[PDB]
Design a binder for these strands. Structure first.
Ligand SMILES: [K+]
Ligand SMILES: [K+]
Ligand SMILES: [K+]
Ligand SMILES: [K+]
Ligand SMILES: [K+]
Ligand SMILES: [K+]
Ligand SMILES: [K+]
Ligand SMILES: [K+]
Ligand SMILES: [K+]
Ligand SMILES: [K+]
Ligand SMILES: [K+]
Ligand SMILES: [K+]
Ligand SMILES: [K+]
Ligand SMILES: [K+]
Ligand SMILES: [K+]
Ligand SMILES: [K+]
Ligand SMILES: [K+]
Ligand SMILES: [K+]
Ligand SMILES: [K+]
Ligand SMILES: [K+]
Ligand SMILES: [K+]
Ligand SMILES: [K+]
Ligand SMILES: [K+]
Ligand SMILES: [K+]
Ligand SMILES: [K+]
Ligand SMILES: [K+]
Ligand SMILES: [K+]
Ligand SMILES: [K+]
Ligand SMILES: [K+]
Ligand SMILES: [K+]
Ligand SMILES: [K+]
Ligand SMILES: [K+]
Ligand SMILES: [K+]
Ligand SMILES: [K+]
Ligand SMILES: [K+]
Ligand SMILES: [K+]
Ligand SMILES: [K+]
Ligand SMILES: [K+]
Ligand SMILES: [K+]
Ligand SMILES: [K+]
Ligand SMILES: [K+]
Ligand SMILES: [K+]
Ligand SMILES: [K+]
Ligand SMILES: [K+]
Ligand SMILES: [K+]
Ligand SMILES: [K+]
Ligand SMILES: [K+]
Ligand SMILES: [K+]
Ligand SMILES: [K+]
Ligand SMILES: [K+]
Ligand SMILES: [K+]
Ligand SMILES: [K+]
Ligand SMILES: [K+]
Ligand SMILES: [K+]
Ligand SMILES: [K+]
Ligand SMILES: [K+]
Ligand SMILES: [K+]
Ligand SMILES: [K+]
Ligand SMILES: [K+]
Ligand SMILES: [K+]
Ligand SMILES: [K+]
Ligand SMILES: [K+]
Ligand SMILES: [K+]
Ligand SMILES: [K+]
Ligand SMILES: [Mg+2]
Ligand SMILES: [Mg+2]
Ligand SMILES: [Mg+2]
Ligand SMILES: [Mg+2]
Ligand SMILES: [Mg+2]
Ligand SMILES: [Mg+2]
Ligand SMILES: [Mg+2]
Ligand SMILES: [Mg+2]
Ligand SMILES: [Mg+2]
Ligand SMILES: [Mg+2]
Ligand SMILES: [Mg+2]
Ligand SMILES: [Mg+2]
Ligand SMILES: [Mg+2]
Ligand SMILES: [Mg+2]
Ligand SMILES: [Mg+2]
Ligand SMILES: [Mg+2]
Ligand SMILES: [Mg+2]
Ligand SMILES: [Mg+2]
Ligand SMILES: [Mg+2]
Ligand SMILES: [Mg+2]
Ligand SMILES: [Mg+2]
Ligand SMILES: [Mg+2]
Ligand SMILES: [Mg+2]
Ligand SMILES: [Mg+2]
Ligand SMILES: [Mg+2]
Ligand SMILES: [Mg+2]
Ligand SMILES: [Mg+2]
Ligand SMILES: [Mg+2]
Ligand SMILES: [Mg+2]
Ligand SMILES: [Mg+2]
Ligand SMILES: [Mg+2]
Ligand SMILES: [Mg+2]
Ligand SMILES: [Mg+2]
Ligand SMILES: [Mg+2]
Ligand SMILES: [Mg+2]
Ligand SMILES: [Mg+2]
Ligand SMILES: [Mg+2]
Ligand SMILES: [Mg+2]
Ligand SMILES: [Mg+2]
Ligand SMILES: [Mg+2]
Ligand SMILES: [Mg+2]
Ligand SMILES: [Mg+2]
Ligand SMILES: [Mg+2]
Ligand SMILES: [Mg+2]
Ligand SMILES: [Mg+2]
Ligand SMILES: [Mg+2]
Ligand SMILES: [Mg+2]
Ligand SMILES: [Mg+2]
Ligand SMILES: [Mg+2]
Ligand SMILES: [Mg+2]
Ligand SMILES: [Mg+2]
Ligand SMILES: [Mg+2]
Ligand SMILES: [Mg+2]
Ligand SMILES: [Mg+2]
Ligand SMILES: [Mg+2]
Ligand SMILES: [Mg+2]
Ligand SMILES: [Mg+2]
Ligand SMILES: [Mg+2]
Ligand SMILES: [Mg+2]
Ligand SMILES: [Mg+2]
Ligand SMILES: [Mg+2]
Ligand SMILES: [Mg+2]
Ligand SMILES: [Mg+2]
Ligand SMILES: [Mg+2]
Ligand SMILES: [Mg+2]
Ligand SMILES: [Mg+2]
Ligand SMILES: [Mg+2]
Ligand SMILES: [Mg+2]
Ligand SMILES: [Mg+2]
Ligand SMILES: [Mg+2]
Ligand SMILES: [Mg+2]
Ligand SMILES: [Mg+2]
Ligand SMILES: [Mg+2]
Ligand SMILES: [Mg+2]
Ligand SMILES: [Mg+2]
Ligand SMILES: [Mg+2]
Ligand SMILES: [Mg+2]
Ligand SMILES: [Mg+2]
Ligand SMILES: [Mg+2]
Ligand SMILES: [Mg+2]
Ligand SMILES: [Mg+2]
Ligand SMILES: [Mg+2]
Ligand SMILES: [Mg+2]
Ligand SMILES: [Mg+2]
Ligand SMILES: [Mg+2]
Ligand SMILES: [Mg+2]
Ligand SMILES: [Mg+2]
Ligand SMILES: [Mg+2]
Lengths: 209, 148
RNA sequence: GUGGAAUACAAACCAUGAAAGUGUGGCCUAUCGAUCCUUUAGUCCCUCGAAAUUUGAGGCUAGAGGUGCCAGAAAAGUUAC
RNA sequence: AUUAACGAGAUUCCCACUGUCCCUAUCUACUAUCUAGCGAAACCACAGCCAAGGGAACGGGCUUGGCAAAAUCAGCGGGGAA
RNA sequence: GCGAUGGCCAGAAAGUGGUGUUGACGCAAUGUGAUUUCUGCCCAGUGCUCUGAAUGUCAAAGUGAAGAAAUUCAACCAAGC
RNA sequence: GUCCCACCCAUACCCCGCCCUCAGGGUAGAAACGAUGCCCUGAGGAGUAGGCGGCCGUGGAGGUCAGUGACGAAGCCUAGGGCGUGAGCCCGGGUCGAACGGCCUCUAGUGCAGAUCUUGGUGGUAGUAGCAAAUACUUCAAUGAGAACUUGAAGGACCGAAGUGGGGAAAGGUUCCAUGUGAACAGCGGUUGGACAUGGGUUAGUCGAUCCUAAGCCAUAGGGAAGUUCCGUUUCAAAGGGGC
RNA sequence: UUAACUGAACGUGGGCAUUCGAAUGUAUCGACACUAGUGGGCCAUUUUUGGUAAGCAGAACUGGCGAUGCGGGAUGAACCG
RNA sequence: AGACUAAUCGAACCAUCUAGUAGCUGGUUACCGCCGAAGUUUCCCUCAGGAUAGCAGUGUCGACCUUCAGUUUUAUGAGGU
RNA sequence: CCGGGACCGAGGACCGCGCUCUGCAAGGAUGCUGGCGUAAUGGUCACCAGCGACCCGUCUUGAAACACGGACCAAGGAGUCAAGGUUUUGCGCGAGUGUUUGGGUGUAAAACCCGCACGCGUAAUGAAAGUGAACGUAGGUGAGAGCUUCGGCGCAUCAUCGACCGAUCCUGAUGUAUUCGGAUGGAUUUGAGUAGGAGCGUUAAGCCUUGGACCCGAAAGAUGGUGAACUAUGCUUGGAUAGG
RNA sequence: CCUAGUAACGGCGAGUGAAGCGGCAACAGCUCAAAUUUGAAAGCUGGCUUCGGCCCGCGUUGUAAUUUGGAGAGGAUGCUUUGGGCGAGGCUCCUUCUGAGUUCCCUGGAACGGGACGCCACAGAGGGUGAGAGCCCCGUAUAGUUGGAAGCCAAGCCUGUGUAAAGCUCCUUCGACGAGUCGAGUAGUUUGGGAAUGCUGCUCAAAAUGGGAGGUAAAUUUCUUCUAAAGCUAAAUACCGGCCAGAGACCGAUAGCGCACAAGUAGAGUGAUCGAAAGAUGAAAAGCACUUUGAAAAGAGGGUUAAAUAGCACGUGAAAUUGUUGAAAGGGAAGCGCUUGUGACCAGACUUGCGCCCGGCGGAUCAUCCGGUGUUCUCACCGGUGCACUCCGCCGGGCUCAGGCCA
């Protein structure tokens, strides 16, 4: 029933909801369990970082396409441009994704530079310590200060473009001919009439001869 | 807390404040929104007019990301400049440069125009613009341009 | 002071009378019908969400098909077991 | 529609018979009754003498009158709207 | 009512069952209720049963025509009524 | 019937005291005040259903009284006292034996006469209703603290061979026998008992079971069913036993 | 709107308590928010409808009982104080 | 005979769905202080029930707004008992 | 202007109004005297006496009712918790607000620290394509607390006339992909709009809805199992019933 | 977590209701069919076996190597890549060892209580011992220490070597890719899925730049994105059923599980099934020796104990109901309100206090001044002086004032 001025209620409590109720009294306990696992995992990968290298990628809709984030893995064309064989890459801490493509030059150039920055900071220990190979670090450079995150050392430096800048006066540009508002109205109008105008031109030319 | 309750005050009094003639039975009148068109019509017509019926056309599989375009008025255009730099322009100490403002980087798509603008030229980049907003920017000595 | 009938103006186009005027149905007090669905009239208008053109369907404004228990469920009896 | 025989089936009359009745009397056994031993249950707001009055229009309690003396045994079927 | 490729009945189905080690002097389904003497008239109504000449009504599938197609329109049309 | 004096008493009216509620004032160069206090002035007080305010009690939690206690904590009894309008609070006397309270905040499974309310315990009735079908008992002696219903003898009776006799089937499970015994059971009693305690007792080649088949039940070959399983019993099966 | 600055509505400036233009009271001004219970009533003077009438059935204004004790009517929800 | 199917039959017994739903009957736990009702309007398969308005409490805010009134007086209208 | 009785004594330095003015009856009682100093006054309980007094809870217009529940006592016994709304009280920040999904850290379920997204708010209106808030010191008139240089300025809020944005109905400029575009000016029309932002989080109370939903209560319905030791009907295999 | 009580479904009523994007937890990739090893079935189960193999069998209607769309096959081209064995050292599990009062007095049956004096502490968590114990006992903290077993990781060393196998850069040309399957119609069920979201039955039944999808049915023309009808795979997630462990503003024997106990027990039902009640002597049994009355059960004495007002019918021991003793009332109920009386029992209050004068007794040092120190900077304290008409205390006598109850 209803008796006063109310908002019409819709509470979905007509099933046996009390059989499926999940409280979380183990929130602090599960946090301790996760930290112990991370600490154990880091110790197993002794000098290596605890992560993999990811590429930079742009979000997909008209909302969010102004921002960039990290993706799944590097493409096969990016790896070839840097000069890293595809079989070697996943064994030195680099992720690979075989189903992403480079439709532009902007994304390709950004990720190629990312790979060769990483390759310059890499230290390779030989498979057998008494017989080093010419592609390994010659062990005088094996001692340095290292990083073990790879998500803070190679993160997204700036996800958004700068929101403000300054130019000298008299260098400001001139507007479009009729004005910005009129340009938008004209672009919309042309799209709504592309089919009508093409048909009119076609029947005119056919009836011409 | 249970000690601040009228339940504690009713102890010792018959009927618990519910009446001797009417008795607080189980569900006199139905459950929920029952009787909306029959015996709860007086309530449903004084409040909530427009409750019953259909209006408009349908839209299968609507994606809300197609309709994203937040707007900002010219009234608050200068609040997007950092505070220290903003005071230099207003006091009249730059007089040689102009600021270039990116609306998309701040999370806006369309520029409406509601208030007034001080007479200092500015450069605005936007996806959409109102007719009045473009008039006031140009009259102050600025220009708006479209960026997608 | 929520949902048949009545009163006085405004904006158009008309009828009558020489004219002032009168006329928004029957001299006055009764003679009637929501949501959902269907069907017709209207603009020539909006949408079918990867893009166009023709069929089809869907919306926006006004009537009609009816609820006489007339603010409007779809409904036959018996029990002396 | 009739119908011999049959019926712990319903109905009317006759003979015999009788305590069914006029009209009620008497006898025997077992109880009840008293004692020793053993030993429950139903029910119970508080209780337990009436007449009238008014009152939810039939009072144990209220109002005005009648009256009214410990503790008790065998029976009884008016009331306790048992 | 029925001559076994059958009548009546059981089961979710079955290379499944009862009547049935059966065959009209038999099996199955209803009414009346020994013997005697009788058992009249009514087929309009509700049922049951028969005959197809009936084109009247008439499903899905199939056939023909129009259309760019979705589709629409026509003839033909089992049993039943 | 009419007229006239005096007198009687409501929680009503008038004057006084006290309680509460409402309204209106005063109080800092602070010798100053639970300023949420104190001082001055006026009016008002009925109440079911119902609304709001303030207070009292109970089980637990944080802080604080450097709290009480085997020289006696908590609980219980008490026509012994004091405080409060009231729910309640405090003290004396007795019993007893290991923990408990005041103040400010926090918290709740927090306050009972009723629900033919739930569980447990107990009355009147009341030493009351009753312990009356199946014909029936009497004498002497012995045992024993104690004998109508224990044993011996002698009388009197009933069942009257379709028995109150002598044996079995189903069912029970030691109820069978001997010795002994306080309570409880045998709706009276009890030295007696199908009761209570301690021991003992059931012997088969011939009596039964075991062997055979009946009405029927279930395996195998096969066919259904998502499946637990349903049908099928000689079938649309390459189905056995006898000697040297 | 009128033949018409002729009117109609809204105003500037100026004048009029030498008295702001009946009586009495003001022991309670205006506006808002949120919500409880109730939605079986009955009695009486005067006015009244149906009925032979009823401690019957139905209305209007006002006062009561319900929700309320106290002094009278011996008793007596509603009468007198 | 609606008879019998373990003291159970006009549809046995046992566990679970299940704390099945009830506009209907019964109950609902300390004290003091202040305020204090309704049985009426409209709609409803509405008549032993609801929503809606009224009657009631609590919190306030605006000024302490010459502000009001279940009343009298003076002038002036309407009515068909 | 003189007599006679009854009940009462609030207040606690002075201050005031006055008079018959060495003082007083003028803003509230003092003076003198006797007995006794304890159960004498006073209090609790029991009983007799005068007057008064129907059994509680409940439904009801009306209960002491010949209306229902209640023999007695002890212990148990009924408006709760979660999500989502709303108005009002307290608190933090304020055009913003919200650490706790997660990460860092720890004396380890506490306390402390971090910030990318996101939610609500900052802009509405149309079914939709779409468009999108200043003529003026953010307007004029009448009231209006407070301030004031005394001329005035006028918060909050109320009444009234206008201005701006979206929708609906008219009008249709310069131009031109010659069929597009929609400027400008109107209209007894309409919006949960603008017109010098108020919100976000949290704490406490009343109210609403779904849930067992203040506590106890049907006649019924559904899913899966167990019974023919009584009784009904049938099948296989056995038994029993004087004398006329 | 958010999207979102949103798009959508619904006698469009009551009601119902997802997904893409975004932030985070956790991250990991692969193998078959379709090709001739064809200069050599190069593959495998089983038996016997000096241990090296041998023998039959499976299999050409296809067992190995090679390829899986990210490709690849076939050619060029010249660089690069790999196999064994030791192994310090560390981690996990079990086990041995760990500081300080029984010091003195009082109460008590017995301190573990009160008082006095000490000590330990990376240990003052918890429990026991005749009452509240850091130091009486077990344990509690800390890194170490004696001994034993098996695994895992790993700094770094010692050794062969290209028969073979592997990666990269370019290219004319090649480039096999899953059928009663997809898809279509119709019926039923289901979903938020709307001219039909998924699943299944029946009928029809494909193709090679082909095929599916692109949330409104249909024809024509474009575009985007993947590659079905064969297969494997850790982590972040669920759960207290099983075996262990640590806890709480939870319950305290009618509560908490039906069960704190010989509880799924005793008992009921033909059966499926139903299903209770019931904790506490004392520190220690020291659980009453003996005498006497009685047939016995028992009683009376006498013992144990701090206590028998703890005796196994056992801590404390309330009410209903009952016995004895004591007080009182009663002519067809009793109980209750206001107000006297009688009898019984009882709490308070009062007992003196301040002041003045006279005498006796005792002690100081009263006022003033000097030195030191505080403090509110003008008010005090301590040391010195004072030394009898001053100051303080007690006792004796007299006087005024105030004091309890009823008139
Ligand atoms: K209420
Ligand atoms: K919009
Ligand atoms: K109706
Ligand atoms: K009508
Ligand atoms: K109606
Ligand atoms: K029926
Ligand atoms: K009948
Ligand atoms: K007969
Ligand atoms: K008798
Ligand atoms: K007797
Ligand atoms: K009478
Ligand atoms: K009386
Ligand atoms: K047959
Ligand atoms: K017949
Ligand atoms: K017959
Ligand atoms: K016959
Ligand atoms: K006959
Ligand atoms: K006929
Ligand atoms: K015929
Ligand atoms: K016929
Ligand atoms: K409390
Ligand atoms: K005591
Ligand atoms: K007796
Ligand atoms: K006898
Ligand atoms: K006999
Ligand atoms: K034998
Ligand atoms: K033999
Ligand atoms: K045997
Ligand atoms: K045998
Ligand atoms: K057989
Ligand atoms: K089978
Ligand atoms: K004019
Ligand atoms: K109301
Ligand atoms: K109401
Ligand atoms: K009534
Ligand atoms: K009446
Ligand atoms: K009276
Ligand atoms: K049974
Ligand atoms: K009803
Ligand atoms: K008239
Ligand atoms: K006074
Ligand atoms: K009642
Ligand atoms: K009663
Ligand atoms: K709030
Ligand atoms: K934000
Ligand atoms: K003013
Ligand atoms: K407008
Ligand atoms: K509720
Ligand atoms: K037989
Ligand atoms: K979104
Ligand atoms: K081979
Ligand atoms: K192979
Ligand atoms: K080692
Ligand atoms: K001692
Ligand atoms: K000692
Ligand atoms: K001590
Ligand atoms: K299909
Ligand atoms: K395609
Ligand atoms: K599509
Ligand atoms: K239990
Ligand atoms: K049993
Ligand atoms: K002691
Ligand atoms: K003793
Ligand atoms: K004791
Ligand atoms: Mg009340
Ligand atoms: Mg009630
Ligand atoms: Mg109600
Ligand atoms: Mg006209
Ligand atoms: Mg006419
Ligand atoms: Mg219509
Ligand atoms: Mg589409
Ligand atoms: Mg009488
Ligand atoms: Mg009478
Ligand atoms: Mg009576
Ligand atoms: Mg009398
Ligand atoms: Mg009798
Ligand atoms: Mg009688
Ligand atoms: Mg057809
Ligand atoms: Mg035909
Ligand atoms: Mg009152
Ligand atoms: Mg509790
Ligand atoms: Mg004590
Ligand atoms: Mg007592
Ligand atoms: Mg003890
Ligand atoms: Mg409770
Ligand atoms: Mg009770
Ligand atoms: Mg009560
Ligand atoms: Mg007797
Ligand atoms: Mg007998
Ligand atoms: Mg008898
Ligand atoms: Mg005898
Ligand atoms: Mg005989
Ligand atoms: Mg004989
Ligand atoms: Mg024997
Ligand atoms: Mg014997
Ligand atoms: Mg006996
Ligand atoms: Mg005996
Ligand atoms: Mg005996
Ligand atoms: Mg025995
Ligand atoms: Mg034999
Ligand atoms: Mg079988
Ligand atoms: Mg089979
Ligand atoms: Mg009612
Ligand atoms: Mg009447
Ligand atoms: Mg009536
Ligand atoms: Mg009432
Ligand atoms: Mg009255
Ligand atoms: Mg009276
Ligand atoms: Mg009278
Ligand atoms: Mg039976
Ligand atoms: Mg319930
Ligand atoms: Mg129930
Ligand atoms: Mg009042
Ligand atoms: Mg209706
Ligand atoms: Mg009722
Ligand atoms: Mg005002
Ligand atoms: Mg005021
Ligand atoms: Mg008239
Ligand atoms: Mg006085
Ligand atoms: Mg005296
Ligand atoms: Mg006395
Ligand atoms: Mg009386
Ligand atoms: Mg009566
Ligand atoms: Mg009743
Ligand atoms: Mg009764
Ligand atoms: Mg308890
Ligand atoms: Mg977390
Ligand atoms: Mg049904
Ligand atoms: Mg039988
Ligand atoms: Mg939202
Ligand atoms: Mg939601
Ligand atoms: Mg659903
Ligand atoms: Mg290869
Ligand atoms: Mg190759
Ligand atoms: Mg130790
Ligand atoms: Mg201890
Ligand atoms: Mg200890
Ligand atoms: Mg010690
Ligand atoms: Mg494939
Ligand atoms: Mg299904
Ligand atoms: Mg479907
Ligand atoms: Mg635990
Ligand atoms: Mg117990
Ligand atoms: Mg229990
Ligand atoms: Mg006990
Ligand atoms: Mg003894
Ligand atoms: Mg003791
Ligand atoms: Mg006892
Ligand atoms: Mg005891
Ligand atoms: Mg007693
Ligand atoms: Mg008495
Ligand atoms: Mg000195």
């Amino acid at each position: 029933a209803i008796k006063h001025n109310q908002q019409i209620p819709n509470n979905h409590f007509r099933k046996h909801w009390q059989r499926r109720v999940r409280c979380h009294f183990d929130q602090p306990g599960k946090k301790v369990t996760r930290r112990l696992a991370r600490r154990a995992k880091a110790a197993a990968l002794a000098p290596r970082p605890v992560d993999k290298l990811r590429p930079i990628v742009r979000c997909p809709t008209v909302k969010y396409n102004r921002r960039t984030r990290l993706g799944r893995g590097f493409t096969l064309e990016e790896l070839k441009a840097a000069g890293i064989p595809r079989l070697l890459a996943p064994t030195i801490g680099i992720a690979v994704d075989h189903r992403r493509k480079n439709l532009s030059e902007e994304s390709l150039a950004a990720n190629v530079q990312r790979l060769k920055d990483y390759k310059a900071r890499l230290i390779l220990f030989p498979r057998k310590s008494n017989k080093p190979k010419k592609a390994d670090t010659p062990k005088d450079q094996q001692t340095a200060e290292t990083t073990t995150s790879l998500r803070t050392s190679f993160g997204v430096e700036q996800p958004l473009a700068p929101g403000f800048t300054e130019i000298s006066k008299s260098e400001i540009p001139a507007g479009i001919e009729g004005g910005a508002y009129r340009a938008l109205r004209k672009a919309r109008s042309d799209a709504r009439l592309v089919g009508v105008r093409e048909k009119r031109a076609k029947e005119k030319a056919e009836a011409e001869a | 807390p249970t000690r601040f309750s009228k339940t504690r005050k009713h102890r010792g009094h018959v009927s618990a404040g519910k009446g001797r003639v009417g008795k607080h039975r189980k569900h006199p009148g139905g459950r929920g929104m029952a009787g909306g068109q029959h015996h709860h019509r007086t309530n449903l017509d004084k409040y909530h007019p427009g409750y019953f019926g259909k209006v408009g056309m349908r839209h299968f599989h609507l994606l809300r990301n197609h309709y994203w375009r937040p707007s900002i008025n010219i009234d608050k255009l200068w609040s997007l400049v950092p505070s220290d730099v903003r005071e230099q322009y207003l006091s009249g100490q730059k007089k040689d440069t102009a600021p270039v403002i990116d609306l998309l980087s701040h999370g806006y798509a369309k520029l409406l125009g509601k208030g007034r603008l001080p007479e200092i030229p500015v450069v605005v980049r936007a996806r959409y613009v109102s007719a009045e907003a473009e008039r006031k920017v140009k009259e102050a000595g600025g220009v708006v341009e479209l960026v997608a």
